[PDB]
Amino acid sequence: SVSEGIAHIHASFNNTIVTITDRQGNALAWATSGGQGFRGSRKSTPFAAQVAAEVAGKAAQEYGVKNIDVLVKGPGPGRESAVRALGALGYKVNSISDVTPIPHNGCRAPKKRRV
RNA sequence: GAACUGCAUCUGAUACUGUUGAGCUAGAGUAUGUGAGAGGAAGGUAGAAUUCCAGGUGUAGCGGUGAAAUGCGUAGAGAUCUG
Numbered sequence: 001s002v003s004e005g006i007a008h009i010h011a012s013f014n015n016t017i018v019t020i021t022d023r024q025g026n027a028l029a030w031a032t033s034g035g036q037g038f039r040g041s042r043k044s045t046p047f048a049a050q051v052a053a054e055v056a057g058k059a060a061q062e063y064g065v066k067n068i069d070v071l072v073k074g075p076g077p078g079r080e081s082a083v084r085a086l087g088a089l090g091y092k093v094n095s096i097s098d099v100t101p102i103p104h105n106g107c108r109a110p111k112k113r114r115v
Numbered sequence: 116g117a118a119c120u121g122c123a124u125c126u127g128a129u130a131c132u133g134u135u136g137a138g139c140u141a142g143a144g145u146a147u148g149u150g151a152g153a154g155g156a157a158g159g160u161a162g163a164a165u166u167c168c169a170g171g172u173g174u175a176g177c178g179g180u181g182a183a184a185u186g187c188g189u190a191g192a193g194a195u196c197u198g
Contacts (some may be wrong), residue, residue, distance in 0.1 A: 104164070
């Protein structure tokens with residue numbers, strides 16, 4: 001159906017969500033580290049992001065995407081592992097971009113944790 | 116005898132303080148030219164980001180923590196794109 005695609009790698013400190021959409025922005029497939037058997041501490045590792053990206057890529061590869069460009073966002077650890085997973089799954093990467101939301105001194109952040 | 120460190124009234128001195136006359140420019144101010152600055156007050160505007168709302172795709176999680184759970188989610192969340 002679609003040959004050009006975008007892989008969004010939304011990676012937080014707790015979880016990483018790998019969605020694969022077309023060039024327009026309509027999601028084709030997605031996977032999460034918390035939806036792959038890993039919970040708690042294991043879920044926020046690069047390996048869980050690797051398996052999530054593998055699952056999402058293998059699910060969206062039946063659609064017909066071979067050309068894909070990735071959009072990494074967030075500071076989580078799996079932001080680098082997911083792209084390697086996509087590259088080793090046979091995806092032809094178009095470009096690696098880091099579009100993470102950065103306010104220009106906007107909304108006040110939550111208070112510092114006293115741990 | 117000394118002292119009573121005091122007070123009062125005359126006289127003298129004019130270095131310093133006071134009161135005065137004149138002068139001076141060095142302290143302090145004025146006019147004129149340039150300069151920097153998140154100095155102040157009143158309006159307008161821009162770009163990111165959050166939240167909310169309405170939609171398209173999409174499907175089973177999200178979120179959170181040292182772990183969790185409360186919470187949010189198949190009444191369709193989160194993710195993604197458009198207003």
